[model samples]
Target: GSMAEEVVVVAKFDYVAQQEQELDIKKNERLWLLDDSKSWWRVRNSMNKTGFVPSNYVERKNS
Candidate 1:
């Protein structure tokens, strides 16, 4: 069995979910990077809520 590594990211701006499969994120909010798609990326919030958000909306937390 193989395991997928989880990456961390921080929201660049506040985002309101417009679709059912999307999750709302706040500026500077820490999130778990799930699936990094071309335009939209899947993420999980601190509440364990998971959904897709615009890839440009968040930045990878290298530190």
Candidate 2:
């Protein structure tokens, strides 16, 4: 099912992409949530790049 509303998140810490499927993100960078998984969450960055990031590495936006 598709999300009814957009889910935004902010990176909690810097992450260097270790795999091709992963994304390198900077701390405090905002991202758009794509898919939520047990360990990895798919997200889109400002550059329109989509990849997986550690679920623990980001926090949901409050507003």
Candidate 3:
């Protein structure tokens, strides 16, 4: 999904077997084209700690 909306994390996740709390999405992000039409999405962390989690990993909560 192309980030329909924002969400947050309810549990701790691991990146490359390490706990990544802080992440940066500016200089540590990547791009991947998933379609022939050239549809791509920016993927990264809050600070490049781990590979990548959902943007919602640290935002939004269902109340």
Winning candidate number (lDDT):
1
Q: Which sequence of candidate numbers ranks them by lDDT, best first?
A: 1, 2, 3
Q: Between 1 and 2, whose lDDT is larger? A: 1
lDDT tens digits by residue: candidate 1, 1-63: 975655788999988887645787889898898788667788887667788887677877868
Task: Provide the global lDDT of candidate 2 against the true structure.
Answer: 0.78
lDDT of each: 0.80, 0.78, 0.31
Q: Please give, for residues 1-63, the per-residue lDDT of candidate 3 as tens digits.
A: 566433222212332324444233332223221222222222334343433334432222233
Question: What lDDT tens digits, residue by residue, belong to model 2 across residues 1-63?
Answer: 664545688899888787656677779888888787657888887667788888677877777
Model 3 TM-score? Answer: 0.17
Per-prediction TM-score to the true structure, in the order listed: 0.73, 0.72, 0.17
Candidate 1, which segments miss by more than 4 Å at Cα? 1-6
Superposition error at 25 for model 3 (Å): 11
lDDT of 1: 0.80
Window of ten residues with lowest summed lDDT in model 2: 1-10
Off by over 4 Å in 2: 1-6
